[PDB]
Design a protein around this ligand. Structure first.
Ligand SMILES: Nc1ncnc2c1ncn2[C@@H]1O[C@H](COP(=O)(O)OP(=O)(O)OP(O)(O)=S)[C@@H](O)[C@H]1O
Ligand SMILES: Nc1ncnc2c1ncn2[C@@H]1O[C@H](COP(=O)(O)OP(=O)(O)OP(O)(O)=S)[C@@H](O)[C@H]1O
Ligand SMILES: Nc1nc2c(ncn2[C@@H]2O[C@H](COP(=O)(O)OP(=O)(O)O)[C@@H](O)[C@H]2O)c(=O)[nH]1
Ligand SMILES: [Mg+2]
Ligand SMILES: [Mg+2]
Lengths: 315, 327, 354, 232
DNA sequence: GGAAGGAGCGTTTTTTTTTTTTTTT
DNA sequence: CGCTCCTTCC
């Protein structure tokens, strides 16, 4: 069959990863040099952490990749016994590698690892660092215990810029010979919200549905991120405007009340314009409405009353 | 066999052509299957919009009548802990097709009920076995899905059912049955449906029951209101007019009489009055603030029981006080 | 010997000496106990509700209802948290206080009571032919303190197995009782005795004990100090008689519960000073009161009414005080830790007074 | 995967690992260590940089060694982490933002941050957001609200208006009714911080903070229950 | 004889349901 | 994070 473009066009070399130019350049330097230290790679979903670690391991180990890499993720058994036996035996293995090259243990989604396993990892890292190096990949670097962080170089991946997403989208379009327009690519990038995976999925969906990637065609399938709609609803200077946004853009589109209130809390946490007193009062009202929704009264009237209270506070 | 089934199940769409209202999603998924490039799917929407029906119909179209042999369906009624993801889903996704029939399909219905650990374990299962397997996740509440899972799925939103699709399905059901529905009854049914087909079908079945001789008796709006025990628009209009114009004693008597005539519940009256007032043109906005806050408080109090008469008097007083601002 | 609260406790309906109408109603209930419905007795604490229930049971069965013994029943939670409950029993009835189980009270309803309801009580007939059946009587003390889950569990047990069991619940307030449970019960209001009847009972006790009383007025004062709690009246009468060489006089002090005096001192302190440090010391006093397992809502009532008894305060101050009391009583009902709400009430009162 | 709320699964420390009898045993001596101070860490970082003078000079990063050393010293007290960060920086020809391992703040440090604010950050919203993003485990525990309730009086040794104390306590009481939602904790902490910032002044002398005493009350209540059962 | 820097203190710990890991089995 | 005492450095 035909693979989805998200997996079909997964970068296979470090030079095809867009964004985080400084970090990717440093990874390329490490690959060409060899002296890879223990590292932690943190960042939001779909920005290239897994791809970056895999590409770096491949470039470092060459043909020895099969015998020199041990990959484990949240879908595998990773308990304390695994650390005691499998990882320990891999780190004990004597493998002849070119100078400056070490075995690599990739621990994808390391944040989910249990406390006992993480504590056990300390001793193996202490003992087998001369021949083995650890690459953790996670979304929250703080979920790795401090004794493990103390041994690793930290690398934080930032959200991808519109320029990098556009460049990769153009490369994919050229490879696939896809017909498009500037407004269509703008809409895809705007709906991706910095997630390259979502951008590729939306591009593929639009192409399959209609082929030509225009703004109207993109917005027929893809929806604008509802956090922005919630921000617009909260920032409306008129009660009727907020109510109209809540009705037309969220309620009648099938968005659940619980999702609306959770997104409202998340957005209100990041409103830079408002004062602290107003912000905390809005948070209180959102929390009370959330309590009411959890009890079973998830009605449009409750959300309208929440908006009315927020507007009252703004005055 | 099908005759004994409840209408909500007897009229479940079998093919994608029987799914109405979701034209964009159906179009896109049909073309994807036509080209055989199905990606990982997320179906997000409110109850009774056609998500489960659509996914089952798509599986039928892909695998014909033998879809039960190469589709792994799991829902909230099944345990789906991290152990289940690690063993059962993993083994199904990592094994060959029955007869090399392309890729396999795993349906995770009501996936918002899955634990965070299981969803985290699902990420690499989805990613690594994409060549051989495709995942479908159905949900009504997106906030229960981890960001990593959301990033991996192509998202499709099932909207509340438009009026035209509901009318078409009602016509189909009326033809299948020996039933006659009046235009006013159809309008009332659409209004009370709120975009959910299940409610439409259940109310239609109850209305057919209510008829003494369904072979010749026609369903009217009165039959619909009797079956649902809901207030009529005239009742709501009269109550609101009495509240906004008549004195306290007259308003109390009017509310009591209207409720006692057909045993109407206060919550439905409040909901109808709120619908009516949402379209009111108010020169003072503070009136809307008072109305919304007080009526929401009354609804929350009613949700826990309490004294019915006090709650009705509270509704009357709240509306009067709020509309004193317009003065 | 036994305390005078229990020593002179009436043991039959004819022995009741106050609220004659209630006695007549109970006797009417005992006329044909064959179809006795479930009962819910509500009224002020210490008025004689449990005494009246026991008198009703004695009327139905006989004096043997007062031959009580205690058993310990073990329950295991879903977390394997083993724990125990005290079950009082007489050959004709059972007595339980599931609220002592806290949030686990529901387990008691789901395991113990249901089983008791399911086991039909039959016995060989002494003279007639065939077995005889008799419904079991179960008393639920502190019914108002049950969690909503336990109250819900009570419903179908009461309805389905009505042939085998009849519940008699006792509470001091019906506000916390869910509507279905009230619907399933015959509600019996138990008024508190008047000052005259309390004084008569105390005078009878005094005569029985041969305690020299200078004047009957003392008894009246005792009544006025008990706020209608007959049990408290008898306890203070005994304490005062023992502390005065079994000779009461008009100058003899009235002994009140120590925590009540502490709350009065706290009220005086709050009135005198309104500052942050005063609030911290009030916190210390509140924590001392809570350490003795005094319920938070009881503390709030007593503090509120002690404050309302202050003569220097004006109408606005008292109105604000009662407003804050109502708000923080609701907050306590819906809260988890009582200290927050008690502190909030005291701080609001300090703000309104200052 | 844990979903457990025991002491050890929350904190890895001597108290949670050992017990009272072991720690208080007369034959066991306990010595507590502090993070390595800025002076020693700077000294050793300079020594390491000197030992690698040749490569640093060749790469043109020798002149900027003092800047990165000073930045590293103020960022962590972990010698191993500091050395690893220095090695990562020096071995890099390009420029990247130097970062060390994150360090959790203590209970009393969090209480002080809420009451008085943070010197580094002037925006209370940013401080609170960072506190909740990085110290969620500490803030979620109900003992934090009790600590705030029992320590807010330390501000100016309790020489502020009763109105502010009433506002803070009423806010905490309202938060106690929110079924432990995150919004409740956020609202409570924000209220406390805003109230104290509204009255912050240079001429203030603050008192000593203490752990909440609820545990003592619980022990006394348990003893009372035992005594009452005996009496019964 | 001015701070600047630093250390030490300010502490204790079950419970509802439900899910999960670990160890011995 | 704030307060209270012992160095450390010029
Ligand atoms: N910087 C990128 N450049 C090119 N493609 C990218 C990039 N980031 C993501 N993608 C694309 O999206 C797919 C997934 O990338 P990943 O490396 O798995 O993202 P991720 O950050 O590891 O997501 P998480 O943390 O596992 S949810 C890749 O196969 C690429 O096709
Ligand atoms: N688009 C639709 N077209 C025709 N019938 C529908 C449609 N949607 C729902 N129904 C009818 O309502 C019944 C339920 O449809 P479902 O597909 O199960 O809705 P749903 O969106 O999956 O509900 P949830 O999210 O699981 S509560 C079907 O058997 C159909 O008879
Ligand atoms: N002489 C006399 N004593 C009573 C009467 N009613 C109650 N008492 C006594 O006063 C006390 C009342 O406390 P109690 O029975 O526990 O009432 P409850 O707490 O409301 O259930 C008991 O010690 C009784 O012995 C009565 O009618 N006559
Ligand atoms: Mg990844
Ligand atoms: Mg479904």
């Amino acid at each position: 069959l035909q693979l989805p473009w998200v997996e079909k066009y997964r970068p296979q070399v470090l030079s095809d990863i867009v964004g985080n130019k400084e970090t990717i350049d440093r990874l390329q330097q490490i690959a060409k040099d060899g002296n890879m230290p223990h590292m932690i790679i943190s960042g939001m979903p779909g920005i290239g952490k897994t791809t970056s670690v895999h590409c770096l391991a491949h470039e470092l180990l060459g043909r020895s990749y099969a015998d020199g890499v041990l990959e484990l993720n949240a879908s595998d058994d990773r308990g304390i016994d695994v650390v005691r036996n499998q990882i320990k035996h891999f780190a004990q293995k004597k493998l002849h590698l070119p100078p400056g090259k070490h075995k690599i243990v990739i621990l994808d989604e390391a944040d989910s690892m249990t406390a006992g396993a993480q504590q056990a990892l300390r001793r193996t890292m202490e003992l087998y660092s001369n021949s083995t190096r650890f690459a953790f990949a996670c979304n929250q670097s703080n979920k790795i215990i401090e004794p493990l962080q103390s041994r690793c170089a930290i690398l934080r991946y930032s959200k991808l810029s519109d320029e990098d997403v556009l460049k990769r989208l153009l490369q994919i379009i050229k490879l696939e010979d896809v017909k498009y327009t500037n407004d269509g690519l703008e809409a895809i990038i705007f709906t991706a919200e910095g997630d390259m995976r979502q951008a590729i999925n939306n591009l593929q969906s639009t192409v399959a549905g209609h082929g030509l990637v225009n703004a109207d065609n993109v917005f027929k399938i893809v929806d604008s991120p509802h956090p922005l709609i919630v921000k617009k609803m909260l920032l409306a200077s008129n009660l009727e405007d907020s109510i109209q946004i809540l009705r037309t853009d969220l309620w009648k589109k099938g968005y659940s009340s619980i999702d609306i209130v959770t997104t409202s809390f998340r957005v209100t946490k990041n409103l830079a314009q408002v004062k602290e007193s107003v912000r905390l009062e809005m948070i209180k009202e959102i929390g009370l409405t959330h309590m009411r929704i959890l009890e079973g009264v998830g009605t449009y009237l409750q959300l309208a009353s929440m908006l009315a209270k927020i507007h009252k506070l703004n005055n | 066999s099908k005759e004994n089934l409840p209408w909500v199940e007897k009229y479940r769409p079998e093919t994608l052509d029987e799914v109405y209202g979701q034209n964009e999603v159906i179009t896109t998924v049909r073309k994807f299957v036509d080209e055989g490039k199905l990606p990982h799917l997320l179906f997000y929407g409110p109850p009774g919009t056609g998500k489960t029906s659509t996914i089952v119909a798509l599986a039928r179209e892909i695998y014909g009548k033998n879809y039960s042999n190469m589709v792994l369906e799991l829902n909230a009624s099944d345990d789906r802990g991290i152990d289940v993801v690690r063993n059962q889903i993993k083994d199904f996704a990592s094994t060959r097709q029955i007869f090399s029939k392309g890729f396999k399909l795993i349906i995770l219905d009501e996936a918002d009920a899955m634990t965070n650990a299981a969803q985290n374990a699902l990420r690499r299962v989805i990613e690594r076995y994409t060549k051989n397997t495709r995942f479908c996740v159905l949900a009504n509440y997106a906030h229960k899905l981890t960001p990593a899972l959301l990033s991996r799925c192509t998202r499709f939103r099932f909207q509340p059912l438009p009026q035209e699709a509901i009318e078409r399905r009602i016509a189909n059901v009326l033809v299948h049955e020996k039933l006659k529905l009046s235009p006013n009854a159809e309008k009332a049914l659409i209004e009370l449906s709120n975009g959910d087909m299940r409610r439409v079908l259940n109310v239609l079945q109850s209305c057919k029951a209510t008829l003494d001789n369904p072979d010749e008796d026609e369903i009217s709006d009165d039959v619909i209101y009797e079956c649902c025990g809901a207030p009529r628009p005239s009742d709501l209009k009269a109550v609101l007019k009495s509240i906004l114009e008549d004195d306290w004693g007259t308003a109390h008597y009017t509310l009591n009489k209207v409720r006692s005539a057909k045993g109407l519940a206060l919550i439905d009256l409040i909901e109808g009055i709120v619908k009516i007032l949402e379209d009111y043109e108010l020169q003072n906005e503070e009136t809307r603030v008072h109305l919304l806050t007080k009526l929401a408080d009354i609804e929350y109090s009613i949700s826990k029981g309490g004294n019915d008469q006090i709650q009705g008097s509270a509704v009357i007083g709240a509306i009067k006080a709020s509309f004193e601002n317009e003065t | 010997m036994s305390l005078w609260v229990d020593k002179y406790r009436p043991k039959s309906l004819n022995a009741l000496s106050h609220n004659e109408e209630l006695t007549n109603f109970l006797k009417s209930l005992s006329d044909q106990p064959r179809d006795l419905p479930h009962l819910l007795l509500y009224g002020p604490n210490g008025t004689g509700k449990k005494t009246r229930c026991m008198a009703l049971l004695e009327s139905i069965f006989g004096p043997g209802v007062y031959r009580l013994k205690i058993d310990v029943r073990q329950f295991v939670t879903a977390s394997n948290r083993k724990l125990e409950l005290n079950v009082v029993s007489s050959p004709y009835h059972l007595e339980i206080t599931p609220s002592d189980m806290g949030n686990n009270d529901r387990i008691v309803i789901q395991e113990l009571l249901k089983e008791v309801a399911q086991m039909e009580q039959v016995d060989f007939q002494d003279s007639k032919d065939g077995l005889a059946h008799r419904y079991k009587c179960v008393i639920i003390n502190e019914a108002n303190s049950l969690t909503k889950d336990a109250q819900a569990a009570l419903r179908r047990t009461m309805e389905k197995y009505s042939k085998n069991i009849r519940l008699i619940m006792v509470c001091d307030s019906m506000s916390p009782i869910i509507a279905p449970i009230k619907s399933r019960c015959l509600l019996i209001r138990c008024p508190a005795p008047s000052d005259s009847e309390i004084s008569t009972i105390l005078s009878d006790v005094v005569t029985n004990e041969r305690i020299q009383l200078e004047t009957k007025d003392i008894l009246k004062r005792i009544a006025q100090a008990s706020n209608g709690n007959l049990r408290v009246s008898l306890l203070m009468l005994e304490s005062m008689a023992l502390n005065n060489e079994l000779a009461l006089k008009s100058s003899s002090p009235i002994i009140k519960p120590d925590w009540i005096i502490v709350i009065h001192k706290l009220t005086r302190k709050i009135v005198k000073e309104r500052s942050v440090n005063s609030l911290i010391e009030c916190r210390a006093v509140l924590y001392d009161l809570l350490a003795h397992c005094i319920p938070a809502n009881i503390i709030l009532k007593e503090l509120t009414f002690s404050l309302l008894d202050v003569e220097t305060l004006n109408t606005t101050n008292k109105s604000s005080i009662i407003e804050y009391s109502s708000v923080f009583d609701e907050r306590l009902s819906l809260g988890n830790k009582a200290i927050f709400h008690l502190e909030g009430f005291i701080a609001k009162v300090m703000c309104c007074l200052d | 995967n844990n979903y457990r709320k025991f002491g050890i699964d929350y904190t890895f420390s001597a108290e949670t690992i050992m017990n009272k009898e072991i720690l208080m045993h007369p034959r066991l001596k306990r010595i507590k260590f502090n993070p390595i101070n800025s002076t020693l860490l700077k000294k050793h970082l300079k020594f390491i940089c000197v030992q690698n003078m040749k490569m640093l000079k060749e790469k043109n990063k020798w002149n900027k060694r003092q800047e990165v050393i000073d930045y590293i010293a103020q960022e962590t007290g972990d010698i191993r982490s500091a050395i690893t960060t220095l090695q990562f920086w020096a071995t890099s020809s390009g420029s990247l933002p130097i970062s060390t391992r994150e360090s959790t703040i203590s209970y009393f440090h969090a209480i002080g941050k809420v009451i008085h604010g943070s010197h580094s950050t002037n925006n209370d919203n940013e401080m609170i957001n960072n506190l909740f993003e990085n110290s969620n485990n500490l803030l979620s525990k109900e003992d934090f609200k009790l600590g705030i309730l029992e320590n807010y009086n330390t501000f100016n040794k309790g020489e502020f208006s009763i109105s502010d104390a009433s506002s803070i306590v009423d806010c905490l009481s309202e938060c106690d009714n929110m079924n432990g939602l995150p919004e409740s904790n956020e609202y409570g902490l924000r209220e406390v911080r805003k109230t104290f910032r509204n009255i912050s002044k240079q001429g203030h002398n603050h008192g000593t903070v203490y752990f909440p005493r609820e545990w003592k009350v619980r022990k006394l209540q348990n003893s009372f229950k035992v005594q009452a059962e005996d009496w019964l």
